[PDB]
Design a protein around this ligand. Structure first.
Ligand SMILES: N[C@H](Cc1ccccc1)C(=O)O
Ligand SMILES: N[C@H](Cc1ccccc1)C(=O)O
Ligand SMILES: [Ca+2]
Ligand SMILES: [Zn+2]
Ligand SMILES: [Zn+2]
Length: 274
């Protein structure tokens, strides 16, 4: 896999930050900052050669969207998916929750195009709407994916909060092959990981038998002494002190965590799509 350029991931975050500022301070479902976020990501994907789909739904009396991006080619009967919710809560820009995963998944999709990668498995990326309403977008997608297509999914990889300011390095303990591939990347960095225990958009996939996995750097729970010894930062402070807050801004990112998890996303997408 290529090394995902941190500066490019950070530049998507800057664009999302400015979209929030331009639209009432947030990127929430049913508010203009969300659709403007979708339009930004979609434009980058279209330019890179993806086939994009806007999947519309209604929730809470407002139109929501999922953005689906299919990379043409690969085995139609073995599809690898990777995704991230693109909405924020209405209190702020949602830069770590979940600009971080949205930006990492977008830059990985652009990196596939830049590398001329032709995976054996067909690649499909997704940006989910209305996760903060209760996984409404990803539930809508799974609920509307025919059983024949669900059976074609080799895996779904989720990235939701991967730049936390006081980070841990958590790997989902779900499908064993997906988990091992993420843990191998971190092993190569000599960065220890822990099993994620602290829901998100992998749940509707997991619950219908699709293999899942993912990366997470912590939210409102407190980093322990033992976790600060292995990863640095501050024991006794939340992993993300601006979780769901107005201060979940461009300042709410640990660049090293964002970089490593973006590089790990690409590592796993390449490995599992071979
Ligand atoms: N529930 C997610 C955060 C989360 C993601 C993954 C695991 C645990 C928590 C959110 O607030 O958007
Ligand atoms: N992005 C922060 C540093 C930073 C924090 C707040 C504002 C600007 C920069 C880090 O990686 O440590
Ligand atoms: Ca990198
Ligand atoms: Zn989230
Ligand atoms: Zn959230």
């Amino acid at each position: 896999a290529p090394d995902i350029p941190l500066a490019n991931v950070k530049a998507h975050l800057t664009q999302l930050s400015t979209i929030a500022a331009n639209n009432g301070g947030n990127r929430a479902h049913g508010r203009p900052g969300y659709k403007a976020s979708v339009d930004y990501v979609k434009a980058k994907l279209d330019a890179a050669g993806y086939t994009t789909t806007l999947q519309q739904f209604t929730s809470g009396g407002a139109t929501g969207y999922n953005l689906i991006a299919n990379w043409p080619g690969g085995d139609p009967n073995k599809v690898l998916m990777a995704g991230a919710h693109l909405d924020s809560v209405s209190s702020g820009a949602g830069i770590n929750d979940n600009g971080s995963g949205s930006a990492a998944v977008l830059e990985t999709a652009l990196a596939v195009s830049r590398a001329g990668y032709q995976p054996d498995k067909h690649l499909r990326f997704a940006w989910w709407g209305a996760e903060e309403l209760g996984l409404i977008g990803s539930k809508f997608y799974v609920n509307n994916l025919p059983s024949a297509d669900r059976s074609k999914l080799a895996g779904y990889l989720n990235f939701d909060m991967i730049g936390s300011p006081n980070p841990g390095y958590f790997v989902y303990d779900d499908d064993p092959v997906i988990e091992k591939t993420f843990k191998n990347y971190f092993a190569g960095l000599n960065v220890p990981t822990e099993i994620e225990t602290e829901r998100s958009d992998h749940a509707p996939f997991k619950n219908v038998g699709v293999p899942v996995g993912g990366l997470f750097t912590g939210a409102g729970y407190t980093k322990s002494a033992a976790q600060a010894q292995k990863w640095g930062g501050t024991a006794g402070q939340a992993f993300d002190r601006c979780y769901h807050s107005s201060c979940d801004s461009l300042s709410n990112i640990n660049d090293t965590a964002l970089d490593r998890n973006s590089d790990a996303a690409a590592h796993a997408i390449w490995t599992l799509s071979s």
